[PDB]
Amino acid sequence: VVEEQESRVHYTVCIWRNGKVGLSGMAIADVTLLSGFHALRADLEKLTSLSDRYVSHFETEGPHVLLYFDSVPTSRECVGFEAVQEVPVGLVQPASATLYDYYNPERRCSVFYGAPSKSRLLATLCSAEVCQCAEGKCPRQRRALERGLQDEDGYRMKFACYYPRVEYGFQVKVLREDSRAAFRLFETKITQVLHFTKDVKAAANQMRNFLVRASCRLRLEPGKEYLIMGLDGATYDLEGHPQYLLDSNSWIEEMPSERLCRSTRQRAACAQLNDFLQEYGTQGCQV
Amino acid sequence: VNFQKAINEKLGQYASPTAKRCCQDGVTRLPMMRSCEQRAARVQQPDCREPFLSCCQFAESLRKKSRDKGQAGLQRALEILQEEDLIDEDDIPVRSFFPENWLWRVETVDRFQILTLWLPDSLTTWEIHGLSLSKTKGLCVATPVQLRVFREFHLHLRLPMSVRRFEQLELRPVLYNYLDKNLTVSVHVSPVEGLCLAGGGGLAQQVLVPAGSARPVAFSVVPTAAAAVSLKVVARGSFEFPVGDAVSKVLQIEKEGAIHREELVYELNPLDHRGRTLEIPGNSDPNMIPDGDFNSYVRVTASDPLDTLGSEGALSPGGVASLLRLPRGCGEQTMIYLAPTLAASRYLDKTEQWSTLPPETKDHAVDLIQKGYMRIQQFRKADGSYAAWLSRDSSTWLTAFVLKVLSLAQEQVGGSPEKLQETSNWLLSQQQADGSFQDPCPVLDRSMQGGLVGNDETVALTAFVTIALHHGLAVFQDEGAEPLKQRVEASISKANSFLGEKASAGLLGAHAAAITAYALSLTKAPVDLLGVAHNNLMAMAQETGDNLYWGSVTGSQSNAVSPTPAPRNPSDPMPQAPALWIETTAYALLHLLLHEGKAEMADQASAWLTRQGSFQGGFRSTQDTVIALDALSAYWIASHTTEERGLNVTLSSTGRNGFKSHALQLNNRQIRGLEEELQFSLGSKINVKVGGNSKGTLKVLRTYNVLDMKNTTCQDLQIEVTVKGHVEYTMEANEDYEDY
Amino acid sequence: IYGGQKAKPGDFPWQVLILGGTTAAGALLYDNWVLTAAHAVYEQKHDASALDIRMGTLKRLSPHYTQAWSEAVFIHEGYTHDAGFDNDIALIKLNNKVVINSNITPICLPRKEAESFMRTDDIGTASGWGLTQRGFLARNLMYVDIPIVDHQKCTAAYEKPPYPRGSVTANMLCAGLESGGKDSCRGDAGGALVFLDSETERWFVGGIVSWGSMNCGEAGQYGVYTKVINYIPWIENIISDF
Amino acid sequence: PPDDLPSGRVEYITGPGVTTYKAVIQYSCEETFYTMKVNDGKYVCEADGFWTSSKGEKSLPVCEPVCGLSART
Ligand SMILES: *[C@@H]1O[C@H](CO)[C@@H](O[C@@H]2O[C@H](CO)[C@@H](O[C@@H]3O[C@H](CO)[C@@H](O)[C@H](O)[C@@H]3O)[C@H](O)[C@H]2NC(C)=O)[C@H](O)[C@H]1NC(C)=O
Ligand SMILES: *[C@@H]1O[C@H](CO)[C@@H](O[C@@H]2O[C@H](CO)[C@@H](O[C@@H]3O[C@H](CO)[C@@H](O)[C@H](O)[C@@H]3O)[C@H](O)[C@H]2NC(C)=O)[C@H](O)[C@H]1NC(C)=O
C-alpha cells in the first residue's frame, strides 16, 4: 500500500487490583479494538522485549489484543501502543475490554471504551445518497404538526392501522437522557395511553424506556411531551417493564404547545391531531 | 544525523555488550509516556540499571532539546513528525516471508507425461525443480525451468476484520497498473442485499490509472444486516482493452453491543419425582441490546463420558484446546493438548470403546499429543527445567507438571527417556532440608483470601512434585534402576515425611489437603499417614443433595448463619463453582478411587464434576480442566457398565417461530455434540419433561450483546482503557507544560 | 511568530490553529470559511475532514477550544506543490457555522481601495503559534508589528545565495525589519498579515504567511507573504458557488 | 409565536407575548458581533396569519457576522 492517509490512534490500558484478595496470579487483558483498526506490532514488542518488563506476551489474532500480565498490582500500571486504521470506518461504536485472572476466571472485570471525543471517527463518512439510504431504518424526525410531502389527509390513522400498523400507542413526557453503548436511552413517563399489546398494566405516571441507535439523527429533549407509537420490542428494564426501540416503524412527534395550537395556521392541523387521538384512543383500528 | 552521532557517542562510553544492551534499551522510547527515572526503576539488575538510567536521561534530554528543530526548508509551515529513533547496529531484517511451494509432489511418469496446472498469482518469477527416481536407472536431477508470472492489471480490496452494523465504511479498492500505457477503468461494486450502496449497487465509476501507478477508488457503504455479506468489486477496462479484475470478499458485520455469555447446567433426574418436570425461565437481562433476534442453545446428554472424551470432545480434530475457548500462549497451557488427550485415550483403551467412534479418532489423538510435545519442548531449559515463557526464569512447578504428563506420552511421540531422566534430576535438586520443594517463581498462587499462604503453597507444591515424581518412575529402565531410581524414591519418601507431619499437624487448606491425600494415595504411603490424611480431608467435605464437593470460606458477613451448603433444588440450576473448587474436588475424587474405589462418595463427587463442566467442553481454565478430566476419566473407567441405561426427555418452548417441541431418545451408547443441540428463543421459557431409569445432564448457553456492564462486575480487579488521537498524543508526548 | 510578544484575549479573534500532517495557522472568513496557505494544507488535501481546526483560544496546548470540522478543501489551481510558493493560497470550508463571540470574529477581506493602507514602511501585524526567539514552538499566541518592504528591495534580497530562481513573484508582498529580529517562523504558515483600515477602524488581511529565509529573522532577509487582493474574485467565486 | 432567529433575539413591541392581528415585533441580531441584512427586522402580524416585515416579506431576516473588531488599542 501507499499513502491513502491512514488514521492512527494511541491506546492506554491501565490495570490494578483493589484489596489483597486474589493476590498475584497470571492475568490476561483482552482488548477488543475499534472497528477497522489493528494494533501496531512494532510498539507492542517494546513492552516485552526491552529490559523493562511491562508485559510477558501478546497476541494480535483478529480485532483483539491479548496481553499477558504476570501479576496485577495494587497501584496503577499502564500499557500503551499505537493502532492504525487500514480501511476508513466512520461513526465508530464503543468496544469492550476485559481483564481476568487466568486460573480463576470468576475474578474478572469488563469495561466499555469509546473513540476520543471530538475525533473524526465519530463523524459520518456516507455519500449523500448513502446517508439517505442509511436513515431508512431510522425513525422519522418531524416537529409539531409538520406535514410531509407525501402525507395525505388521515396520515396518522393510516400509519396506526394500515402500515406499518402500530402495536402500541403512548403519550409520554421525556424525563432524562442516558448514553449507553451505541445507543441513547430516554427515560420517560407515560401521560396518556392509546393502545398496547404486550405492555399490560401500562398507565399514566408509569415509566418506560425508549431507545434509539446512535447512528440515527433523532433526539428526544427532556421536558417535552411526545406522541410515540410503534411495535413492541423484546427487551425489559430493571423493574421488569418492557423497553421500546425507535426505528423507521415508529411514529414520534412532539405535541404542540397551547400557544402554537391556537395559531390561525396550525389551528386546523392541531384539530386533526386531537381528533385522531380521541378517535384512535377510544375506538382503535376497528374502522 | 546529529541525533545518531550523539547516541552512538553515548554508546561508545560503554565497552561491555551487557552495558551496551542496557544502554540501547534506555535510548529506545517507550510507547506510553513513563518518566525516565520511573521507567528505569523497573530493571532487575542494578549493574544494568546504572547504564540504563544514564542513557535514558541523556536520550530524553537530547531528544527534547533537538525537538521541533528538524525538517528545515524555506516554507513557514512545520511538519509534525515523531521523535527520532536510534538506527540499530544490530543485524538488518532480511525478507523472511515467501509464497508457499505449490507443485510440491511426486508423480509416476511413464516415459513422458503432461500436467495441467493452475498458476498461483505473484509478481516474482519462479523456477521449477525436479528429481527422477527410477528403479533401474537411478536418481536424476532435472535442470531448472523458469516460469514468470506477471499481472497486466491488479485489483486489491481491503476490508476490516470486524465491523459493527450501521457504522459508516468507505472501502478503498486499489487499482494496480503494471502496463506501460495509461489505462481508464470502469469500476463498480456488485449489488447485494444488506448493504446501503451507491445507486443501490452497481454504480459505475470511471477512474484513470496511469502507467506503472496505483489509484485507490472510494466507495461509500454502510451495513444494515446482522449476519455476513459477501461483496464483490468489479473492474473492467474500457475501449478494446480486455484488462480487468474482480475481487469478492466476505465482510463480517457484528451486532452493536458487547458479547455476554451465560452458561447454566441442570441436573436431569427422573428417578425422583421432583426432577421429572422442570422449567427453565429464559432470559430477560436489562442490559441486552434491542433487536438482534437472539437464540438460546440447549444441549441435552445422557452419555456424559463419550460426549466429553469422544469425537465431539477431547478427541475432536482440534481437541479440547478449541473447546476450552481461552488463549493458550503460555507454557503451562500446552498440556491442554496432552493431559486431556491422554485421559481420553485411557478411557477408550480400558473400556475397549475405540470401535464405536470412527477409526480416524486415533489419528486425531496422536496428532494432538505430538503437537503438544513439539510445542512444550520449546520451553525446555538447558539444565532440563522448564520456564513459563521463553528466556524466562525456570519454574519448579511447571517442570513438575511437564514430567507428570510427558512421562506417559513419550512412547507415542518419539520422545527421549534420557531427557525426562535429566528433568527429574533437576526437580530433586530443588528439595529443601525439611523435605519440601521450593519454586523461585511459581506459575500458580491460588491460595488467596484464605490466610497462611506460605503453609498452603509449600505443601501443595511439595505434593504436586511428588505426584509428578511418581509418574516419572515409569520412565526408568535398567540403566537408571540403581543410580537415579533410588534417589527419586528416597526423595519421595523424604517429602512424604514432610507431608505426613503437616497433614497430621492439620490446619491445611482444603486444596492443600486434597492434593496431599492424592499424593499419599498415589504413592503407597504408610497406613497411618494414609488414613489420617483421608480423615483430615473428609472433615472439610461439603455435601448437598447427591453432590459432594470441597470449597473455601470467604470470611463472614458479620454475625451470619452457619449452614452454608444448605439450599439445593433439582429444579434450580447447578451453580458454576470457581476454578479452585473444581481442582480441589478432582484431587479428592482421584484420592477416593485409590483409597476406597467406586463408592457412594466417589459417585456423589464425580456427579458434581459431571454437572460442573462448561457448555462446550472444558471447565473453568486449563489447570482445572486437565485435573478434572483426569479425575473423571478415572471414575468413568471404574463405573463403566454394559447396561443400556438411558432416559426420555421432551423439550418445548413457545418461541418467535411458533410452538416447537422435541422428543429425544437418550442412552449411554450415543455420542451427542454440536450438531444435535437445540435452538430456542432467548426470551421464551422452555419446559422440560424427563423420564427414564438413569440420571442425565442438561446445559443451556445464552449468548447475547449487552449495551452496559453489570454494577457488580469489577469488585476486585480493575481495568481502564483510554485512547487519544495521534496529533493529540504526540504533542502530549513532546509536552513541556506547567513550566517554562 | 519570531521575536514578538504575547497576545491578550481579543487581540486576534480571527486566528485559527490547523493540525494535520503539518502545524499551521489560518484566518476565519465569515462564519464558515478559513483562509490559509496552500502549501500548509496541500498535505492531506483530498481527505476533507483530515484537518483538526481549533480556534477561539490563545494557547496551543489548551484542552478547551472551539472545534470546527472541514467539509471540503480548496487549493488554488495556480499553485504547484513541487518547489516554490507562487499562488500560495487555500480556502477551507467549515461544515458547521462558527459561534461568533468575544474571542471569535472573522477578519475582513481587503477592499480594492485598501492598498492606501498597505503602503511601504507602514506597520502591519502578524500573529500565530510559531518557533519563538528561544527556538521552540510558542505555548501561547505571539505577534509582531512589522513594516512593509518595497517589492524591488525584497526581490533584490532573494534568489541568492541558496534560494532558487523565480522564488519571488508578482503575487507576493514582503515585510520585516532591515536588521532582522521581527519575522514569522516555522508554524505560522497560513496566518494573517493584518492591516488597520483607519477610516472604518476595522482590520483586514492583506497578506498570508508563506515563506522566507530558512533562518528566521535573519538580517537582510524579509518574510514573504501571499498578496490577497489579487485573488478577491477567486475567493468570491468559490464561496458563492461551492 | 415568532420564528426564532439564528444568532438573534425577538422583542415584543406591542406587549408581552401578544401575537394577534396588527401586533408588532422587533427582531434584533446579537449586538456588536452580528449585523442584520435584507431588512431591518420590524414585523407585524398580517391578516393571513403570517408575520410580515415592513417591506411585505413573510420570511425571516438574516444575521451577518461583523468582521474585524480587534481588542488592540
Ligand atoms: C499518461 O499519464 C501521465 C500521468 O498522468 C500523463 O503525464 C502528464 O502529461 C502532461 C502533458 O504532457 C503533463 O503536463 C505538462 O507538463 C509539462 C512539464 O512536464 C509542462 O511544461 C506542460 O505545460 C504541461 O503542464 C503532466 O505534467 C504529466 N504528469 C505528470 C505527473 O508529470 C500523460 O500525459 C498521459 N498520457 C497522455 C497521452 O495523456
Ligand atoms: C423411552 O420411550 C420409549 C417409547 O417412546 C420406550 O420404548 C418402549 O419400550 C417399551 C418397553 O420396552 C415397549 O413396549 C412394548 O410395546 C408394544 C406395543 O404396545 C407391546 O406389544 C410390547 O409387549 C411392549 O409392551 C415399546 O414398544 C417401546 N416403544 C417403542 C416406540 O419402541 C423406552 O423404553 C423409554 N425409555 C426409558 C428409559 O424410559
Swiss-Prot record, chain A:
Protein name (record): Complement C4 gamma chain
Superkingdom of the organism of origin: Eukaryota
Annotated ranges, domain NTR: 138-285
Disulfide bond residue pairs: C14-C78, C126-C131, C138-C216, C161-C285, C261-C270
Species of the source: Homo sapiens (Human)
UniProtKB/Swiss-Prot annotation, chain D:
Residue ranges occupied by any Sushi domain in the UniProt entry: 1-65
SS bond list: C29-C63
Coiled coil regions in record: none
Superkingdom field: Eukaryota
Official protein name in the record: Mannan-binding lectin serine protease 2 A chain
Native source organism of the sequence: Homo sapiens (Human)
Residues of the full protein shown: 368 to 440 of 686
